[PDB]
Amino acid sequence: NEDLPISMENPYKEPLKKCILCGKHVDYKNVQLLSQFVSPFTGCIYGRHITGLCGKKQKEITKAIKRAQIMGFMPVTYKDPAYLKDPKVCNIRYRE
Amino acid sequence: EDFIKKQIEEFNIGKRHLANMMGEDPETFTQEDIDRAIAYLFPSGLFEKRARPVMKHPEQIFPRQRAIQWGEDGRPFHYLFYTGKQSYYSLMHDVYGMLLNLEKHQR
Amino acid sequence: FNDKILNEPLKHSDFFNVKELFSVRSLFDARVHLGHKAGCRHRFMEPYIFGSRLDHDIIDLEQTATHLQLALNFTAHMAYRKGIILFISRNRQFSYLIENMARDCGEYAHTRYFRGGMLTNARLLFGPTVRLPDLIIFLHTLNNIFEPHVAVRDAAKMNIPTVGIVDTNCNPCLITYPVPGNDDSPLAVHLYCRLFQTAITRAKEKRQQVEALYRLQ
Amino acid sequence: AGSRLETVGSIFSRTRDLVRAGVLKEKPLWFDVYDAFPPLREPVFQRPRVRYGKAKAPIQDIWYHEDRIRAKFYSVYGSGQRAFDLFNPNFKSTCQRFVEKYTELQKLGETDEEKLFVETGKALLA
Amino acid sequence: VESFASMLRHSPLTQMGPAKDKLVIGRIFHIVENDLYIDFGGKFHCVCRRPEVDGEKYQKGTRVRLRLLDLELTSRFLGATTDTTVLEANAVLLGIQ
Amino acid sequence: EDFDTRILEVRNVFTMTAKEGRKKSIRVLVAVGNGKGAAGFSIGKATDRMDAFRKAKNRAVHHLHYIERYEDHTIFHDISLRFKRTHIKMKKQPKGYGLRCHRAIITI
Ligand SMILES: [Zn+2]
Ligand SMILES: [Zn+2]
C-alpha cells in the first residue's frame, strides 16, 4: 500500500562542482588573472590537471593567454614579476 | 589390525627363543641384549647399520599408520575428515582454541 | 524393512516445524538484509535484491524467508536420513566458528584450503570406499579471492545438493538452495550457524524417537 | 555411472533421467527428498553475460517520503550533533524526530513549504 | 508480522543516509597490537590505529566515537568487470563512549 | 556389463620438447552408450595406444547424457544446430527409414 519506497529524483547530491572561474569572464587585457596560470620560471601554461579548470574555461584561458602574448599585454617566457604575489590557485609541488 | 598381531607374537616367540638360544636364564631380558646377540649370531661386515640383521619389536620397524576412519555406513569419526591432513587441522584448532581463552580474559 | 519412518516425513509439510527458528524480525536485527555495493552485484542476485539505498544493495527479507523454510527443511532431512553434511566456508573471520559448530553438532567442517580434487578425485586421495557428503552447506559461497568456490562446481560434478549463503556478489546458480542473505557480518553468521546447528540436532532427535517407537511396536 | 556435466542440466534432471536409463542402480539419499520439497528455482547452469546496450538493471533506487526534510537538516544545520548507535532497535535520531515533527503538520496543514520548516524550526528547542 | 518494507523504513541504517562524516558509536571487537577492529553495526568492520592520547583505554567492548567515512572502500579499476571490495570501511577513531 | 564403447578417432598428435625432441602421443575420442537412451563421450590421451583406449573408455561413463528420445526408433523433432563452425541438420523420420547420416553419427 503506502509503505514501499517511491521513485524520486535522487536527493543528497550537492549541485556539481563549479570550477574556479565558473561564472566569470576571462579577458585578454586581464593579465593578472592570466599570469596566475603560467609558470613563474618558464612562462608556460599550466594544464587542466594543475589549474583545476573545466575544459571550457581552460580553453578560454589558453585562447586568451596566447591572445595576449602577441598583442604586447603579457610576456612569453616568464610570469610578470610585478604580479607574483597573487593567490596561488595552481597546485604545484616544487620546494614543498 | 591383525597384521601387527602376527608380528608381536612372532617376536615374543623369537624373544623367548633368543633367550633359549644364548645361555641367558632370564626369559625376560633386555633389547640391547637382543641387539648384541644377533650381531654376534649373524655377522655381516655390511656397512649400513640398517643393512645389518635386526630382529626388533615390530612397532619399531614397521612404519606407523592411521587406522581406518569410516566405520560401517560411512560416518568418518573426525569432524575434519574431509580436509585431509585431518589431525593437523584439528591440532591447529587445538592451538587456536588455546589462544582465545587467554585473550578473552587477559630446539 | 525400515521404510515406515522414511516415508512419513516426506508427506508431512514442515515436519520439524522449522518456521519457529526465524522470521524476518530475527533476520533484520542481525543485519542479514545488507548486501554489498551496486558496483559489485552479480546478475543473479537481481531477483533477490529489494533495492539500492545510496548504492548499498538491500536484500529481500521476504524472499529470504521463503527460502529458509525450504532450505533449513532440506538440511533437516539430510540429518534425519543420516547423510554426511559438510560445512564449508573460507571466511577466515568465522573459520574458528564453523569448525566449532561442527563439534557442537555431529556433522562435518572443512574451512581450510581446498585441495584440488577433493570431491572429483576422492577415491585416490582417500581409500577407495569413501562416502562423499550428501549435502554441502556454504557460509561464504565466495572464495578468499572473489570468485565462486571450487566446491560449487565439484559439488555439481559429483551430483550433491548444496545449500549456500548467497550475498549480493555471489553466484546462486549451480547451488540448489540459495539463501539470499548477508555473510560478512559477525552478527549475521552467528545467527546462520545458530539456525543450521539447531535445525539438524532437532532433526537428529526426531530420528531417535521414531525408531525407538518402531522398536517397541 | 553418474554424470559429471554441470552445464547440461540440474542435478535433479541429471539424475531423474539416469534412473529411467538404469545406469545408477541405487537411489541417492537426497533424491527422494528433493523430489518432495523442491527449490523454487531449478539450479540449471547459466553463463553470466554482460549488459551491453540500453539494458540497465531493473532494480529500484529506493527513496522514502521523509528524505526531503532529512536532506535539508543536513544542509541548513549540521549533521547529527548527537552520535549514532544503530545497535538498539528503534533509535530515534535528532533528524528522525525532526521528520516526525514535520509529518504531523501536513496532511492539510499546508501553509507554505518553507514555512513548514519555519514552524518546526521553533519547536525543537522547546 | 511486520512487513519488511516497513521495518526497513524504521531502521537506523536507513535513517542515517549518506554516511559522510557522520558521528557513529561502535563496539571494538578484536584487538591486535596496534590495530583496532570496530564493529559499529553495518555490514563490515573497520580498522583504526591506537592513538597516543589515552592509548590504554581501548579494550574489547570499548564504545568509541567514529566519523564513519564512507562505508564503501570499493573501486573499479582499469580492467575490472566488478569492483574490488576490501571488506572494510575506513572509519576514523575519535574517542571513547 | 551392458554398455559398449566405440572408438571415434585415433590421432597421432605431437608436441615438442627441449630434450626429447619430438614427442608423440595418441589422442583418442570414444563414444559410450547402452542402447536405451543413455550415452556419453570422452577424449583421453597418453603416449601408448592401449593406454589412451582405457583412459577414455573408463572416463566416458562419468560424463554421459540421457538422450531423451521418441519411441525407440527416432527423436522428438527436427533440430538444426551450428556448433562452432559445423552446421548439423538432423530430421525426425518415420519408422524403418534407416540411419542415413554421417558415419560417425552412425556409431552414436
Ligand atoms: Zn566551469
Ligand atoms: Zn559478502
Tab-separated table of C-alpha atoms in Angstrom, chain A residues 5-7 10, chain C residues 36-60 168, chain D residues 51 55-63:
chain	number	residue	atom	x	y	z
A	5	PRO	CA	9.674	3.209	-1.464
A	6	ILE	CA	8.766	5.757	-4.105
A	7	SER	CA	10.830	6.682	-7.129
A	10	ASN	CA	17.905	11.315	-6.172
C	36	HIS	CA	27.451	-5.150	-0.908
C	37	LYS	CA	27.728	-2.296	-3.348
C	38	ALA	CA	25.769	-1.958	-6.536
C	39	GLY	CA	29.202	-1.775	-8.119
C	40	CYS	CA	29.868	-5.477	-7.449
C	41	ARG	CA	26.421	-7.042	-7.658
C	42	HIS	CA	26.030	-10.172	-9.693
C	43	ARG	CA	23.498	-10.841	-12.399
C	44	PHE	CA	21.654	-13.493	-10.447
C	45	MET	CA	21.181	-11.615	-7.209
C	46	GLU	CA	18.909	-9.450	-9.348
C	47	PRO	CA	15.628	-11.109	-8.229
C	48	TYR	CA	16.750	-11.299	-4.607
C	49	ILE	CA	17.545	-7.595	-4.205
C	50	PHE	CA	14.974	-5.230	-2.700
C	51	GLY	CA	16.742	-2.135	-4.000
C	52	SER	CA	19.799	0.013	-3.582
C	53	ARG	CA	19.923	2.659	-0.883
C	54	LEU	CA	22.536	5.319	-1.723
C	55	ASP	CA	24.213	2.458	-3.582
C	56	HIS	CA	24.002	-0.216	-0.945
C	57	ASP	CA	22.095	-3.243	-2.159
C	58	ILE	CA	19.322	-4.361	0.179
C	59	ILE	CA	18.310	-7.978	0.134
C	60	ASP	CA	14.661	-9.103	0.053
C	168	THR	CA	24.899	-9.569	-3.403
D	51	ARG	CA	24.557	-5.873	-20.418
D	55	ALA	CA	19.561	-2.579	-20.735
D	56	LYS	CA	20.141	-1.072	-17.319
D	57	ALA	CA	19.469	-3.193	-14.323
D	58	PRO	CA	15.784	-3.176	-13.349
D	59	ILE	CA	16.355	-2.626	-9.624
D	60	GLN	CA	14.858	0.412	-7.959
D	61	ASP	CA	16.953	3.068	-6.248
D	62	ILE	CA	14.933	3.246	-3.039
D	63	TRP	CA	13.759	6.605	-1.705
